Amino acid sequence: GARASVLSGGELDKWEKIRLRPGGKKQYKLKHIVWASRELERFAVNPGLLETSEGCRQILGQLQPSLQTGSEELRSLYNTIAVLYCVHQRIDVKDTKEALDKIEEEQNKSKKKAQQAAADTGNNSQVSQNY
């Protein structure tokens, strides 16, 4: 498309502003987007639907667990998706780690919100012992 479907020209220019490594000299680009797209399509995921911050977040959440024991490439893909999502939400980034920490922080906060929320309006209990 004129300005792709995932990210527009400008969005792509910025998307290609994130570094792959903190001590490295790599950055995102249409190449990475194509790679991710290839993996997405190969994973049975729609690329266009990956344009929405929701779809990006969904994928990230889909690999979230796959990360537990995912591959190096799979992990890198997840990070890339996270960055994409950040751009979708209009989040500034510098490195893949930064974006990862950004999403990691947000997510963590989210989980908490869920906890504090439940607690606030809920309850829980437990027990365990043996002599």
Query: Could you give the CA distance from residue 55 to residue 62 in angstroms, rounded to a whole number?
Result: 10
Using a 10 angstrom Cβ sphere, with 0-12 exposed, 13-18 middle and 19 or more buried, the burial of residue 13 is exposed
Query: Could you give the CA distance from residue 38 to residue 20 in angstroms, rounded to a whole number?
Result: 19
Residue 55 tokens read as 């779809």
**Structural domain count, the chain:** 1
Residues 27-58, buried b or exposed e (16+ Cβ, 10 A)? ebbeebbeebbebbeeeebebeebbebebbbb
**Structural domain harbouring 29:** 1-131
Residues 83-100, buried b or exposed e (16+ Cβ, 10 A)? bbbbbbeebebebbbbbb
CATH number of the domain enclosing 116: 1.10.150.90
Q: Calculate the CA dihedral of residues 87, 92, 94, 99 and round it to 10 degrees.
A: -60
**Could you say which DSSP state residue 45 is in?**
-
The answer to whether 84 and 15 are in contact (CB under 8 A) is yes
The breaks in the chain (C to N more than 2.5 Å) occur after none
* Residue labelled with tokens 């570094």: 19
109-116, long-range: CB within 8 Å, 24+ apart, which pairs?
Answer: none
The answer to whether 85 and 60 are in contact (CB under 8 A) is yes
79-86, long-range: CB within 8 Å, 24+ apart, which pairs?
Answer: 80/28, 80/32, 80/35, 80/36, 81/36, 81/50, 81/56, 82/56, 83/15, 83/18, 83/28, 84/6, 84/7, 84/15, 84/33, 84/36, 84/50, 84/56, 85/53, 85/56, 85/57, 85/60
Method: NMR
